[PDB]
Design a binder for this molecule. Structure first.
Ligand SMILES: Nc1nc2c3c(F)cccc3nc(Cc3ccc4c(c3)OCO4)n2n1
Length: 207
């Protein structure tokens, strides 16, 4: 297990998301589905010039998996997936300029729901999750598990769980008072409201 410090700017973003009073938390789901859609567009596009990039799986989809026993909501996609370099360096680089833009917008009168427009919607997971684990596999790299409970650090390890083929699983370890996002009716409401035109099938698993 390797431990890394977030850049100060990303840490500050995560603290803002965790600390600001903001009742409209449900938007986290829209943001992670949008992230999945983006990742799926990428593999779909790349597969047009190189069909063998789909040898790791042809199905392009998003699954939403609630688990009351574990108190987790998992968003799974079969998108392009993330490399170790993404996890350690690249995502952070993109997040830095986005965080700065988002911060300035917020002071100008924007709200937290506009986070996605700045390319840092992933961190909205921390509206509802005390801990986020991300399992991811890109065609050019190994399966990795990224994990953070914020506090300024994240971990990366090689994953030895079930091999996933290709894509990303975002596992939300929900805060004690945010278990509404495990309820079938609540998840369906949120998807219908914010994600109804996503261009990939979204399957909400039942318990
Ligand atoms: N599902 C999914 N696939 C991608 C992704 C991807 F598949 C390729 C490149 C970048 C990506 N960025 C994100 C957003 C993201 C940002 C920061 C993160 C993260 C995911 O996981 C750990 O830190 N996602 N989310």
């Amino acid at each position: 297990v390797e431990t890394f410090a977030f850049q100060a700017e990303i840490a500050q973003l995560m603290s803002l998301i965790i600390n600001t009073f903001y009742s409209n938390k449900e938007i986290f789901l829209r943001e992670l589905i949008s992230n999945s859609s983006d990742a799926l567009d990428k593999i779909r596009y790349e597969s047009l010039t190189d069909p063998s990039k789909l040898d790791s799986g042809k199905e392009l989809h998003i699954n939403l998996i609630p688990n009351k026993q574990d108190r987790t909501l998992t968003i799974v996609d079969t998108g392009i997936g993330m490399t170790k370099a993404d996890l350690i360096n690249n995502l952070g680089t993109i997040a830095k300029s986005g965080t700065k833009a988002f911060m300035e917008a917020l002071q100008a009168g924007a709200d937290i729901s506009m986070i996605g427009q700045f390319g840092v919607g992933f961190y909205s997971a921390y509206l509802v999750a005390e801990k986020v684990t991300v399992i991811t596999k890109h065609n050019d790299d190994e399966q990795y598990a990224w994990e953070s409970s914020a506090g300024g650090s994240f971990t990366v390890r090689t994953d030895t769980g079930e091999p996933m083929g290709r894509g990303t699983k975002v596992i939300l370890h929900l805060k004690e008072d945010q278990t509404e996002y495990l309820e079938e009716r609540r998840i369906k409401e949120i998807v219908k409201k914010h994600s109804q035109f996503i261009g990939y099938p979204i399957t909400l698993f039942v318990e």
